Amino acid sequence: ANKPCIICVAITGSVPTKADNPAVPITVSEQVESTQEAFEAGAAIAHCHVRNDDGTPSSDPDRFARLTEGLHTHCPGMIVQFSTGGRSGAGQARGGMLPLKPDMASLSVGSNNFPSRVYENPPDLVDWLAAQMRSYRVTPEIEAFDLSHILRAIDMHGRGLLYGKLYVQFVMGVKNAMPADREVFDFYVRMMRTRAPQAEWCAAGIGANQLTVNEWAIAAGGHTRTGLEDNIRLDRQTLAPSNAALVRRSVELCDKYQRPVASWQQAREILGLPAAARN
Amino acid sequence: ANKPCIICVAITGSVPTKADNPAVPITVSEQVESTQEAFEAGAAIAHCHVRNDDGTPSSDPDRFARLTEGLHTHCPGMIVQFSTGGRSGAGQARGGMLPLKPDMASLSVGSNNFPSRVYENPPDLVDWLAAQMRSYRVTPEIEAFDLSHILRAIDMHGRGLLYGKLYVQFVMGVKNAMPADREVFDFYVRMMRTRAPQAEWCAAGIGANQLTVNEWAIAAGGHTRTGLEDNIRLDRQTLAPSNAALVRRSVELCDKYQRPVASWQQAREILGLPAAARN
Ligand SMILES: [Cl-]
Ligand SMILES: [Cl-]
Ligand SMILES: [Cl-]
Ligand SMILES: [Cl-]
Ligand SMILES: [Zn+2]
Ligand SMILES: [Zn+2]
Ligand SMILES: [Zn+2]
Numbered sequence: 076a077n078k079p080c081i082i083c084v085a086i087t088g089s090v091p092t093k094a095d096n097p098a099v100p101i102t103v104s105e106q107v108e109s110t111q112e113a114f115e116a117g118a119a120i121a122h123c124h125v126r127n128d129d130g131t132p133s134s135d136p137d138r139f140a141r142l143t144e145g146l147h148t149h150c151p152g153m154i155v156q157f158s159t160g161g162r163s164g165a166g167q168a169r170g171g172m173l174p175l176k177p178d179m180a181s182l183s184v185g186s187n188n189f190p191s192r193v194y195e196n197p198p199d200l201v202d203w204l205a206a207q208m209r210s211y212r213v214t215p216e217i218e219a220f221d222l223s224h225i226l227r228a229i230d231m232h233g234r235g236l237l238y239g240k241l242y243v244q245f246v247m248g249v250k251n252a253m254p255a256d257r258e259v260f261d262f263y264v265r266m267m268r269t270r271a272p273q274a275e276w277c278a279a280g281i282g283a284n285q286l287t288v289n290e291w292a293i294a295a296g297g298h299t300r301t302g303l304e305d306n307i308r309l310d311r312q313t314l315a316p317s318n319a320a321l322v323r324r325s326v327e328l329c330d331k332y333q334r335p336v337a338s339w340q341q342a343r344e345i346l347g348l349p350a351a352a353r354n
Numbered sequence: 355a356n357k358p359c360i361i362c363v364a365i366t367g368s369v370p371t372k373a374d375n376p377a378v379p380i381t382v383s384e385q386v387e388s389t390q391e392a393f394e395a396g397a398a399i400a401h402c403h404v405r406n407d408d409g410t411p412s413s414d415p416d417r418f419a420r421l422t423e424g425l426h427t428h429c430p431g432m433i434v435q436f437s438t439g440g441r442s443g444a445g446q447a448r449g450g451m452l453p454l455k456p457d458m459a460s461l462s463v464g465s466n467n468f469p470s471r472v473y474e475n476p477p478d479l480v481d482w483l484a485a486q487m488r489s490y491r492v493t494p495e496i497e498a499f500d501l502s503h504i505l506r507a508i509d510m511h512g513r514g515l516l517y518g519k520l521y522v523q524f525v526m527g528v529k530n531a532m533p534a535d536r537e538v539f540d541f542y543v544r545m546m547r548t549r550a551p552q553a554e555w556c557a558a559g560i561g562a563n564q565l566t567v568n569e570w571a572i573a574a575g576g577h578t579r580t581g582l583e584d585n586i587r588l589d590r591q592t593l594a595p596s597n598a599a600l601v602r603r604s605v606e607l608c609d610k611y612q613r614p615v616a617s618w619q620q621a622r623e624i625l626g627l628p629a630a631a632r633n
């Protein structure tokens with residue numbers, strides 16, 4: 076394509092533990108180190124959650140602040156994207172980190188099932204989170220778990236609800252949500268190209284679908300995500316030894332399709348972000 | 355097509371009240387009368403909720419039993435479909451009417467947003483409701499509020515989770531869910547035709563989209579739903595005077611597209627139901 080490809084690394088998430096894979100970074104220091112390697116390997120965006128030291132989920136703003144400072148000092152220029160995840164926190168707590176003014180924050184605009192629960196995003200919460208992102212000038216990345224979420228995001232964006240330039244992530248392979256289905260993927264891409272041609276998109280696959288969805292996205296001209304949050308293995312059994320190892324796989328696919336890996340500067344420009352991180 | 359078209363009437367729902375439109379049937383007697391007229395007008399399936407006398411939502415099995423007896427005596431042969439709706443009840447209460455052995459029951463297999471809330475269908479509840487429908491030999495009608503729900507239903511059906519023959523309803527126009535979008539509709543139809551060619555489908559539109567979605571479904575060879583549950587008006591302002599009036603609109607569209615209105619006998623055969631109601 077020669078079009079640069081933005082690789083996002085989803086470093087930790089809310090679910091995986093060191094019992095699942097010893098490579099999962101849990102503490103801030105672990106996260107900074109893991110993220111730096113990933114940055115070096117080609118990731119331009121860090122998609123961040125925080126944890127308690129024991130690995131349990133957290134939404135604590137002070138932990139986000141600590142992580143951010145580490146990323147700003149060790150990964151200068153890298154785009155810092157905070158989760159507002161529903162497995163990491165509940166209600167308005169899910170937006171308590173927003174006043175820190177990250178570059179970006181992931182945002183669900185719909186609800187859907189998850190492996191063991193409803194992933195709840197009530198309309199009032201969606202609207203509140205979106206308003207906070209307008210206030211603090213935080214560009215959302217929309218985490219679209221189903222088709223109507225893509226359409227909703229497009230409508231919202233046109234209506235001014237979503238700060239900045241529209242960036243939609245197709246999340247595929249989550250149990251009880253949307254599987255990694257190639258025909259659906261192509262329809263998703265069609266919706267973006269036809270209904271939101273000025274917007275950007277990416278795609279993320281879970282588990283064994285991570286690498287496959289990377290390939291789909293990269294070959295189709297979009298952007299993509301990888302990392303331990305989404306997948307802890309290299310095949311049916313083999314554990315992935317780092318976030319960076321997963322990034323390198325994505326990089327190889329960029330090479331295969333003759334697309335440069337977007338630098339953090341390119342990624343900022345593509346996504347309509349400030350040229351330098353705030354704060 | 356000359357293919358018969360099954361018209362379902364959604365008589366009451368959980369939301370509309372007599373304050374919204376005086377034609378909404380609330381009590382069992384009202385419901386039987388309204389349903390009979392609709393039956394006479396061409397509806398083969400009654401999609402039923404029950405209410406307290408004051409119009410508030412209910413899941414009471416005894417009220418379902420009463421309604422069923424009325425429909426069996428006044429609308430003999432008509433297919434009786436019970437709601438397991440999340441606005442009418444919570445948790446396993448949403449399946450408490452199933453032991454009455456209706457012909458069918460509506461079932462959500464995913465979650466999604468609604469006008470003012472998350473429409474919660476946790477995976478454990480979906481699985482429980484499905485198991486109850488297997489036990490009691492109640493054929494589900496899948497209420498698909500988004501694309502992944504259609505795919506999930508197809509997968510479930512192939513795996514034996516869904517009793518009887520697969521029947522999927524595309525529900526379009528619910529605020530914060532999936533809008534009535536023609537391109538999505540055509541994709542939905544493609545999924546059914548290609549992924550589940552032995553299955554049947556229908557489509558239902560909310561509000562001002564009711565008539566439009568009727569036309570889309572009827573012209574495309576599928577089946578459809580109408581009724582006061584889904585829409586209380588005939589245009590921007592004019593109230594619909596009965597469930598039957600809404601059915602007649604659907605019938606006109608069948609005439610337009612040269613499709614006969616399925617008799618209740620045809621509908622039973624198409625949907626793989628017993629030739630006569632149990633009990
Ligand atoms: Cl879960
Ligand atoms: Cl490596
Ligand atoms: Cl609601
Ligand atoms: Cl009429
Ligand atoms: Zn995340
Ligand atoms: Zn800083
Ligand atoms: Zn209903």
Ligand SMILES: [Zn+2]
Nearest residue numbers: 423426632633
């Ligand atoms: Zn009976």
